[PDB]
Amino acid sequence: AQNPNCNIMIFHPTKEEFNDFDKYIAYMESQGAHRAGLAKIIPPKEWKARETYDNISEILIATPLQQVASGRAGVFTQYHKKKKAMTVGEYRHLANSKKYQTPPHQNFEDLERKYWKNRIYNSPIYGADISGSLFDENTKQWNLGHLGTIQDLLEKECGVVIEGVNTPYLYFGMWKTTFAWHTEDMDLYSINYLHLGEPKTWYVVPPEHGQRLERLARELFPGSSRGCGAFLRHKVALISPTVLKENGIPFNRITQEAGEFMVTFPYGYHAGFNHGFNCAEAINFATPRWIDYGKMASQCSCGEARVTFSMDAFVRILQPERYDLWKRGQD
Ligand SMILES: O=C(O)CNC(=O)C(=O)O
Ligand SMILES: [Mg+2]
Numbered sequence: 622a623q624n625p626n627c628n629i630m631i632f633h634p635t636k637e638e639f640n641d642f643d644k645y646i647a648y649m650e651s652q653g654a655h656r657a658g659l660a661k662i663i664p665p666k667e668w669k670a671r672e673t674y675d676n677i678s679e680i681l682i683a684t685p686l687q688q689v690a691s692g693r694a695g696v697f698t699q700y701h702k703k704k705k706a707m708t709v710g711e712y713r714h715l716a717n718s719k720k721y722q723t724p725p726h727q728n729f730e731d732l733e734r735k736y737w738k739n740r741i742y743n744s745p746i747y748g749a750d751i752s753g754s755l756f757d758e759n760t761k762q763w764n765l766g767h768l769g770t771i772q773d774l775l776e777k778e779c780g781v782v783i784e785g786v787n788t789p790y791l792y793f794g795m796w797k798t799t800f801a802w803h804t805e806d807m808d809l810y811s812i813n814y815l816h817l818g819e820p821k822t823w824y825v826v827p828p829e830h831g832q833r834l835e836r837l838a839r840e841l842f843p844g845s846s847r848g849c850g851a852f853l854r855h856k857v858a859l860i861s862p863t864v865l866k867e868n869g870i871p872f873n874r875i876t877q878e879a880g881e882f883m884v885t886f887p888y889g890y891h892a893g894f895n896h897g898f899n900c901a902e903a904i905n906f907a908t909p910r911w912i913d914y915g916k917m918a919s920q921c922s923c924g925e926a927r928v929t930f931s932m933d934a935f936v937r938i939l940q941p942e943r944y945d946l947w948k949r950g951q952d
């Protein structure tokens with residue numbers, strides 16, 4: 622079995638190997654990359670996502686989210702407070718202000734220590750889930766706006782034609798902006814490209830150990846657990862690496878820098894934080910190996926997680942028994 626310790630693998634494809642996305646994901650899995658739940662892909666030196674970032678300040682963040690923490694340093698929840706719209710130029714100026722900027726630090730490890738010691742005492746503002754793409758339409762390789770769709774994958778594998786579309790989203794981050802512990806909708810893969818700026822630290826639990834994370838989360842957030850059998854779908858729970866170690870949860874960590882891709886694998890729980898002002902683009906995707914994860918994926922039926930038009934059809938075809946009760950939570 623490849624990668625039995627479930628380490629995060631880092632790949633360095635050639636420009637020739639960067640031409641066929643599906644075949645390279647399949648290659649990564651042949652090397653055991655999926656066992657970690659997360660892999661890093663450094664693009665070939667000749668590749669570029671676009672020519673420059675000079676003209677991005679007029680993108681609008683229509684609903685910036687202030688992330689307000691509650692709890693103890695190692696175990697907290699966050700809620701998202703809606704703020705007034707601002708442009709990317711405005712947001713970058715805010716990220717760089719004395720109140721919100723990245724503090725002095727020695728290295729990524731010192732900064733991680735400061736995050737966990739200090740995250741809960743601050744409320745950073747995140748521009749999340751903005752529909753759109755920063756890939757140049759003439760970038761042919763690994764262009765997240767030109768991938769094959771999950772709906773076409775389901776048609777090719779299962780023969781059924783469904784409604785829905787699959788498009789990318791932009792994330793503008795600042796120091797301490799946080800992604801809570803989650804797997805993707807319907808336990809899909811995700812791919813994430815850090816277009817510019819400061820890094821993003823990721824934590825991940827191997828898919829084969831996801832249930833151990835879930836069990837700890839039920840113990841750590843007991844009221845949440847009673848309210849919904851899949852409350853991690855709400856994307857509000859943070860658990861520090863120290864707390865995971867104290868409870869014997871297997872995980873790994875890695876820092877993504879500008880110009881690198883991360884891929885999350887089906888049922889790979891992940892969480893993390895941004896080091897400073899940055900802009901990432903991400904999209905979900907499927908492969909043939911995903912189908913069985915999609916069939917088994919948990920769902921939020923308390924109604925909090927409230928998900929896309931396209932996810933309907935996935936639940937409808939792959940989880941027909943759930944379909945009824947799940948759409949009661951989504952309507
Ligand atoms: O970039 C972020 O804030 C979070 N991204 C992901 O969870 C992802 O790409 O799967
Ligand atoms: Mg602009």
Ligand code: NI
Pocket residue numbers: 803804805811885891
């Ligand atoms: Ni994710």
Ligand SMILES: [Zn+2]
Pocket residue numbers: 848849850851852854855921922923924925926
């Ligand atoms: Zn729920």
